[PDB]
Amino acid sequence: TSWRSEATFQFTVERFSRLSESVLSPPCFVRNLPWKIMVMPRFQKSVGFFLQCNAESDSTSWSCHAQAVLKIINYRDDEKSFSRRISHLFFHKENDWGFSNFMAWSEVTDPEKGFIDDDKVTFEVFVQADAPHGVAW
């Protein structure tokens, strides 16, 4: 259910080589809160990859600590998939966390590397969140 303490979800970004604006995935519910993958180009140059939590809510009382593994899937060999982990206390003033320089843009878009196919790149997040505070009183 949506109350699950952890989950793994993916978001495939299309026309990747042409990415210009920040893109946001649909929400995945963990601890009954909406978690999303955020991707953006940073300086073409590098891949910005972040995990967002409960950003739409106008509440300023909530907080949720979580650990997560942010991964860019290598479709040719999952052992070649690239991942980094984070630990962050999410709340209204700091609702996302990740890496602005997660991977070199030239590497992810290199057709010989196995991360891109038909100009599509798949992002994955495995999030393990603690019980939230200031939400479900």
């Binding site: 953006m40 966390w97 990740g98 890496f99």
Partner: peptide, 8 residues
């Protein structure tokens, strides 16, 4: 470094 931190 990978530039860990908020999207901003």
């Amino acid at each position: 470094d990978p530039g860990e931190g908020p999207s901003t």
